[PDB]
């Protein structure tokens, strides 16, 4: 942004804006588990399949 | 104890999140893959 | 001006796609000096009685 | 190459020893190094400016 | 608003909801009917009961495709509806404005 | 250099080709290969 | 333009689209029905699901040719349509210009 | 016999001396002993898994 | 050139004396000699198999 | 750091001394240096790859 009002219109002093930047990497996140194909079918109680 | 007093009233909030991809489900329940080939029918 | 002209370098750039696939393969030519004889196996025993 | 020196014998700020005088033509405009210090060095020209590249 | 009373905003009608889910359009059916056993079918149904409708939907699609008798019955049933003439009628003892709307 | 004189109107064309199978497209998209779950996010 | 709204340019109507694809006209069917097993049929269908319609189309052509009962049924079904009288009607409560166009 | 080894020349997580590494292929699948510690040792096959029972 | 090689530390059934045990020998997809013995020796792999161009 | 080694189970192209062998697992994926030669280095990951960072 712009700085304070100075105290001299005689011999005015120029200024510049500062360009700021922020860099961030969006790396992935994961998590998983292994299960057997027969066991999910060989489970009549409803558990092992709410996975 | 790592607290964070925050105004959360300016145009932006602290620790802003960035939603790139939703929670697309990844599954491995078909013989298509080598997990069931190399292993005893391991689905993932 | 900008006190960090390096940071604003990415701001002041632009990307235009004109060289992307600005080329093509040579025109098909085997039609003139060849004919397709598709088969359905890993061999072709041609046969004629002269 | 230095594409701008922004000097023209202008009164560029040089904050040294607690006082910001103008010692020489330290005007520069590039993204090589010390941009944060380039803020202090090239804040106030205070006099007329004219850039003449040194091709450095 | 809608019939259920949920607030309606015309801003969201410009684009389909699934447009921002380009991942869905690239998926392929897993064909769970191939190599199906009674235990596998029971597991599929139970899992569907718990909110995993993907496998159930794919199994139903395969079942529709692979059975000629079932497919013929379902097609006949649906074509029965598709051939019915339809009309839009105004509500009970509707007024002139309601008749015009209908 | 690299010459060849051939007939074109004959019942046979020299150097005949064989389009035995079409230009089938082979792809590695997502839960179809192991390169994308038990591996990096690679596709071929 | 067309019904779908895509821009229409009369320049491209002078020549067929496939004219610049002389390779297609020289192809011959591969006849995938010969030596067909259930595993081969399943692979053909699955591959077709993924965008390889060539093998599926050739298999369907062979299936149509090699089965007399299926061919007779399909021919009867199509000839049913081919024998229907048809007419072009103007839209609902059309005007004189629309009637002339129809 | 051995139910499974899941070695593929890679362990799941062999953590020793306060540092967790990945080597020596110490993957087992059985409740013979140290099941609570078997959860920590196992449960992380970063690389592929190959099961070749040693019939021990 | 010979097409056929197994270089993934993969297991194959090689019979030494009265038993068949893991080992990598011929490991080729082409045969001109020892076909009857190769069949026992060239049992397709148990684990991951990848081929290369020995060109020997 | 090394975002990816691209080494495990895969072998890439390595052109040295006029003969481009395949070994030593020199896979990498970054824009640090020798980016142009990265194509030549990764010109033949013939075998299956399995990334694992070295945190360099």
- Phi-psi category of residue I20: left, alpha or beta, with phi > 0 → left and psi -120 to 50 → alpha: beta
Which chains reach chain E with 3 or more Cβ–Cβ distances below 8 angstroms? A, B, F, G
Dist CA G56 CA G47 (whole Å) = 8
Residue whose structure tokens are 């196996």: C41
Is E34 at the interface with chain G, CB within 8 A? Answer: yes
Q: Which residues contact E73 (CB under 8 A, 6 or more apart)?
A: none
Q: Where are the beta strands (DSSP E) in chain A?
A: 35-36
Q: Are G68 and G75 in contact (CB under 8 A)?
A: no
Residue of chain A whose Cα is closest to the Cα of C1:
A16
Q: How far is F40 from chain G (nearest CA, A)?
A: 23
Are A12 and D47 in contact (CB < 8 Å)?
A: no
**HEC assignment per residue over C1-50:** CECCCCHHHCCCCCCCCCCCCCCCCCCCCCCCCCCECCCCCCCCCCCCCC
Rounded to a whole number of angstroms, the distance from the CA of G58 to the nearest CA of chain C is 13
Helical segments of chain E, H only = 38-49, 53-66, 68-82, 96-101
Could you tell me the sign of the dihedral formed by the alpha carbons of I25, I30, I34, I38, in that order?
Answer: positive
- Closest Cα in chain B to E23: B24
CA torsion, points G95, G96, G99, G100, in degrees to nearest 10? -150
Who among E37, E41, E43 is closest to A49 (CB)? E43
- Residue I56, classified by CB atoms within 10 Å of its CB into exposed (0-12), middle (13-18) or buried (19+), is exposed
- Answer whether C touches I (≥3 Cβ pairs < 8 Å): no
I touches which chains (3+ CB pairs under 8 A)? Answer: B, H, J
Residues of C in contact with G34 (CB under 8 A): 40
Length of chain A: 51
Q: Where are the alpha helices (DSSP H) in chain G?
A: 38-49, 53-66, 68-82, 96-101
* Residues in Cβ contact with E23 at an 8 Å cutoff, skipping those fewer than 6 apart: B21, B22, B24, F30
**Broken C–N links (> 2.5 Å) in chain D, after residues:** none
Q: What are phi and psi of E66, to 5 degrees?
A: -90, -10
D14: nearest Cα among D31, D28, D30, D1: D28
Experimental method: cryo-EM
Q: Which two tokens stand for residue A4?
A: 């304070």
E96 — phi, psi (to 5°)? -60, -45
Cβ pairs bridging C and F (under 8 Å): 32
Which chains does chain F touch, 3 or more C-beta pairs < 8 A? B, C, E, G, H, J
* Spatial distance between the Cα atoms of G89 and G101, rounded to a whole number of angstroms: 10
Rounded CA-CA distance E100/F17 in Å is: 70
Asked if residues F44 and J46 have their Cβ atoms less than 8 Å apart, the reply is no
Verify whether the Cβ–Cβ distance A19 to C1 is below 8 Å. Answer: no
Angle between helices G53-66 and G68-82 (to 10 degrees): 100
Only one residue has tokens 């409708």, namely E53
Residue with tokens 């077709």: G48
Report yes or no: J30 and J55 within 8 Å, Cβ to Cβ: no
**Which of E39, E47, E52 is the closest to A42 by Cβ?**
E39
């Amino acid at each position: 942004q712009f700085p304070k009002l100075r105290e001299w219109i005689g011999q005015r002093v120029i200024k510049d804006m500062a360009a700021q930047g922020y860099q961030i990497t969006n790396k992935l996140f994961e998590s998983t588990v292994g299960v057997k194909r027969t066991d999910i079918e060989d489970d009549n109680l409803g558990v092992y399949g709410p996975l | 104890f790592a607290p964070a007093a925050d105004p959360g009233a300016a145009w932006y909030l602290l620790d802003t999140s960035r939603s790139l991809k939703p929670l697309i489900y990844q599954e491995r329940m078909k013989p298509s893959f080598t997990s069931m080939t190399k292993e005893d029918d391991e689905q993932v | 001006a900008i006190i960090t002209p390096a940071l604003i370098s990415a701001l002041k750039t632009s990307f235009q796609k004109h060289f992307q696939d600005a080329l093509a393969t040579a025109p098909s030519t085997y039609l003139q000096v060849a004919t397709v004889i598709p088969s359905t196996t890993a061999s072709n025993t041609y046969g004629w009685l002269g | 190459e230095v594409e701008g020196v922004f000097v023209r014998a202008t009164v560029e700020r040089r904050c040294r020893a607690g006082f910001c005088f103008d010692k020489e033509g330290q005007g520069f405009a590039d993204g090589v190094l010390s941009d944060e210090q380039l803020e202090a060095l090239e804040s106030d020209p205070l006099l007329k400016v004219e850039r003449c590249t040194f091709s450095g | 608003v809608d019939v259920y009373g949920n607030p309606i905003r015309t801003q969201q009608l410009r684009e389909p909801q699934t447009s921002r889910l380009a991942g869905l359009a690239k998926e392929f059916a897993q064909h769970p009917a191939k190599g199906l056993t009674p235990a596998k079918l029971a597991r599929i149904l139970v899992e569907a009961e718990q909110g995993n409708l993907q496998a159930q939907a794919e199994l139903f699609m395969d079942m529709e495709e692979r059975d000629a008798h079932l497919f013929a019955e379902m097609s006949k049933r649906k074509r029965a509806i598709l051939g019915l003439d339809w009309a839009v009628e105004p509500p009970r003892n509707a007024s002139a404005a309601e008749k015009a709307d209908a």
